Design a protein around this ligand. Sequence first.
Ligand SMILES: N[C@@H](CCCC[NH3+])C(=O)O
Ligand SMILES: N[C@@H](CCCC[NH3+])C(=O)O
Lengths: 349, 341, 341, 349
Amino acid sequence: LDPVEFLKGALEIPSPSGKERLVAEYLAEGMQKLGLKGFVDEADNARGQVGEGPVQVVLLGHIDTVPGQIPVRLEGGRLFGRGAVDAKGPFVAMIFAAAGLSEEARKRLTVHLVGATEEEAPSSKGARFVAPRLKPHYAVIGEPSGWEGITLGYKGRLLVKARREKDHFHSAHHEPNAAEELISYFVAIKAWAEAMNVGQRPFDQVQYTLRDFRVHPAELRQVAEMFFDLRLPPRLPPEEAIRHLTAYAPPTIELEFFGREVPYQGPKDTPLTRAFRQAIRKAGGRPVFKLKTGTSDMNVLAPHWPVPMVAYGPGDSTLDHTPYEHVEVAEFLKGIEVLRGALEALAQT
Amino acid sequence: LDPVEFLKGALEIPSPSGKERLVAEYLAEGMQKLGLKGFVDEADNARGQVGEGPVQVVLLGHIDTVPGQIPVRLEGGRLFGRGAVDAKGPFVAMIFAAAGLSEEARKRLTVHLVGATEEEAPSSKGARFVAPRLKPHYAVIGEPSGWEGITLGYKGRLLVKARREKDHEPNAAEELISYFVAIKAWAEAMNVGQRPFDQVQYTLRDFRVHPRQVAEMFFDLRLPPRLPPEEAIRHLTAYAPPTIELEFFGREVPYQGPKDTPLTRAFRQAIRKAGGRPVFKLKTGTSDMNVLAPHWPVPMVAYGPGDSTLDHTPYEHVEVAEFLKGIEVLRGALEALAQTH
Amino acid sequence: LDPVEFLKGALEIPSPSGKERLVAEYLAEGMQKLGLKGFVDEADNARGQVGEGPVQVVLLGHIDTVPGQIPVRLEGGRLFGRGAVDAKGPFVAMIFAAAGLSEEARKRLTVHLVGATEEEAPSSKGARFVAPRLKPHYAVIGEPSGWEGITLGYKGRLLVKARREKDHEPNAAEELISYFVAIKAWAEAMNVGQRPFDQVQYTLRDFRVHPRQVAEMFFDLRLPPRLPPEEAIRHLTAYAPPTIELEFFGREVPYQGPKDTPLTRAFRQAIRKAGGRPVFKLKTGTSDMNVLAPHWPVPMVAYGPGDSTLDHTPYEHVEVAEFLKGIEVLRGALEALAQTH
Amino acid sequence: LDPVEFLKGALEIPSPSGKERLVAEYLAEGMQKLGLKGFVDEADNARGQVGEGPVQVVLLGHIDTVPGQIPVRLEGGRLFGRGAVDAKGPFVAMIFAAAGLSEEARKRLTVHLVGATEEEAPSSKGARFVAPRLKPHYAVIGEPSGWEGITLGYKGRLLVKARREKDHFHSAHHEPNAAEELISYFVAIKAWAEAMNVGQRPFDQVQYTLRDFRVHPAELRQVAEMFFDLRLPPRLPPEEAIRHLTAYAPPTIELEFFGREVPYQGPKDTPLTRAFRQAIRKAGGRPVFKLKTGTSDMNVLAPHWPVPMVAYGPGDSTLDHTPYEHVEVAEFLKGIEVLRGALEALAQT
Ligand SMILES: N[C@@H](CCCC[NH3+])C(=O)O
Ligand SMILES: N[C@@H](CCCC[NH3+])C(=O)O
């Protein structure tokens, strides 16, 4: 069973959020064959396990991707595919790493593998299913950090739907219509963020994105709806961010919040962090700590698992969600090498 | 034929822009019966004609409405329905006023009746159909002035489609918002110290986002005399970088006619005789008056019973008493200017 | 002593906050002469006292003004000057009303007169000096209500200094602007649908830029009952990142007293007897009523002749007739509540 | 006469705008000694000349600096001083370059040197004095481009003073006061620029800077004043930019415009451009074309001299106006070398 050919076959199985079963089965097979006792759980996660040691470590990735396949090709040193980077590659690298684990290490560690479902959706159903069922001492989240990167944190998230409906009236009267009231709210949110962001590094900025806007063709009534989202710095968790957005909203506007995720930023010096620092050096690289603008199951899991936790994976995260998503094979391989080393170093304490 | 019941039956026939034929039919029927030689023209306008005299008077209204039907009912002295005020009401008032003209006036005037199609749309197809097919000495536009009101002017108009196309920092939609916010701030600065007729009005009609990335906005400007379409277009294209593509359509010139005119004097007398106090008005929407001024270089006002603040609202209605006063005023004004000739 | 000429002489003495001594002197003099045992206290307040009765009534006004002297003149029935309305006028009206009290009332009431210092400043030093030195059963605050007007309430207040300090993309000044623009947008959203008394008012008082780079702003908020100082402070500090430093001072609680009270009833009678129609008012500024409510848990209103829209303007004046009606109303109200006791 | 010691002595003579005479005299001396016939003109420019050829080339720098000396020290390979980079170094490099010119080149070229006054002020008096007096075939503007850089353009400029005065009134009334009306104008300008800048590279963006804001302590009247400036892309020259700012200003606001400068962006392939491309290669570097966000006498002179023109100078322009302004000596020297080569290559056609 070869790392890159196993990944390729993973990439070839489409797995938009909610439709992960086929790939879970595949990942579970490969894990069965590698001695990781693979299976597919009640949430359709790809599950595995190796080792019998008392130190519980969870290697948790996600096996869903954003919708829309890209044809898979190995060409040059680059493997192309939806999920190459985000994040079938990272999770497959977890699988092979765990598969090549020392007897010494299978003595100190019990390593649980979770290919989580619906990480790309608001639910994170998969990570949430597993949260009350595992009690790790350490957790590694499979998201692309680059093979030399150790990511220490990810921003939180808030999804907002805003709505205005009112009686229709002539477009020449000075009173704003429903769409305009929504725009004006959004503009107020921009102003709020600009003030909130003064002097702040990107990890500490409130960021917003207008995702959708719809206006009903008006007849008796005007209806407009707006979907936006925020990426949340540590200083502004979701419940605080809701109080702010609510205070900036006039009473004419209906708000619905969802996809609440808390930010997470872990300390620079833990057993886990040293373990990866050492493994990247062994593998011949220069480790760099990273903080990421995105949101991951690290945010989802932090409230449940009060333990040292980082995110690691080969590949370049700026290829998330693009039509030419790919990883360098040599990077993917260094990725496996780093995961194994990190586990071994963990076991050597 | 009863004025109010005839209007009611007009309201009961949906005539959203482009689908005016059924109601034109009904209006033409009614005009036949009244001795107004009713018919439907090629542009599906309701047409009628009375009189033989040398001086041509056009009473031009419109018979399309914006969409959304209001259940038609008579209740508490008010007739409710889409078009009650804008502008089936005013046109029906024109029909009945014409129908009761003295034989004295029918020899001084020839009076043409046009229930125009597509006035609520960018085309104004209706009014543009008859523009070169009639040669008025005077013209009255049927839009709600209030029964004691005579409307001297309507703002011009410009419609705009803005488009932005990108690749998946801020996205196409957000960039269109920045444009919209700048044009708003521009309009506020241009408007400081101006009365409503002299203000620029800038409205977002629609905003469409398509998950490359692409977004469009449609805007609707109403234009004061100091800022006609080609001027407004120069500002807007100047504030748009080449990356935001603008399309212009629906251009109409503002119009504001003089306070003292034979038409104007006729209506003030007609109004006083009907027991009211006449009041000049400038309207902040746009009308077929704007479409027609460039073709008919003649005295022109807009008149009709009803309160224009109900235009396009879901409780559109006219007061019955006021509607009847509309009929009376029209007839007397028509009468007064037969006397001046 | 003539009321208007006495007021005039008061206006003619500058009393910007902190420099009230000369005019307190003059007011104390005048109160001596009137048999009101005039003096100047340690906080430089103008003080006076009349009556012997068990029920203490405080007529408290202020004698400082904002800076900028207006040439004092009597002209067209109007007395012009800094303080004419805010609030030398109301206090002088209180002096003369007290000076003409019946001997019947002088046995029911003891009436204290305070021309407070520094009411225009954050300190309100004056009113805070007397707060624990008097024990009123009722209190009247001398601020322009209009002669037919009785003021039930004034908004609270919060002052803010914002500072930003950097190294020479956007500069410190611009970043302070972003904060200001956000707090404005916050206030507009909080105010939608609220009457003025229930609105938050957010004013830029000063903006200082010093070419590291450093800039400061000073803001002045007026606060509705639903948003007192400590609440307003929680919003503002929440919307400020740590990089923008906020200082709070000048906090005053909003106050809005009940419509039906012996004080309130007294003034409505006094007003009717003076030939006017009494009207409750809520004022959008801040006053010593706000400073004093927390100390004097007793019925309280503000009253004085003059139109408060002239506060702080360069044409500040009171109409002479209205000023005299102020005297009359005050006296009658004082009289009416001696009768209820 | 040594390049770096001559520069050092230039840096030691303070020359804030308007007070350049002392340094002009010094620069003129050195030019006299080097055979460039130095003198100080009616505008206090440092003037020189070398060569008798029919091809007129002007090497024009500026000898004024922003106010505020920094103590001069040669330490490490770095020479510290107000003007090291902007722009006494560049002009001194012009002087020594011209001084070491071939006989072959003094035959084809007449090279005019101008150490212009008041370039850092709105006037640009010095460049404007010289504009009607020289008819170059080529012009090189002495501003720091880096020793490997050839700058092809600089943005234009507009200075704006805005004022509002009105009758004073109570701070609790909803009507905005004078300072607030000015802020609101500025905010409108921000919105205008944000829309103008959609999709635009920095050289093509309208940029603004609030320079000062004053509010009179109000007594009978409110007075507020605001000073800001714009850096102007090629698509928006100063007269167009005035129409825009004026349209966004309500009639209550008084505007005064000044320091109008037109943007300039020259073509990539001219005799001058090839001449510098070749000289940087000879000197062992990789030439890069640059467009700059700042404004220079290149903008001032372009309308007068319809000829190929670039900006060149050793040093890093991000040290303009900072308290530790300096140039690497070795860079300064490469700078001279490049200027000479460029002149020689010009003469060799
Ligand atoms: N009267 C309608 C339509 C104007 C366009 C004329 N074809 C309006 O104000 O929107
Ligand atoms: N009445 C003044 C001052 C209020 C502060 C009381 N010490 C104002 O509205 O600004």
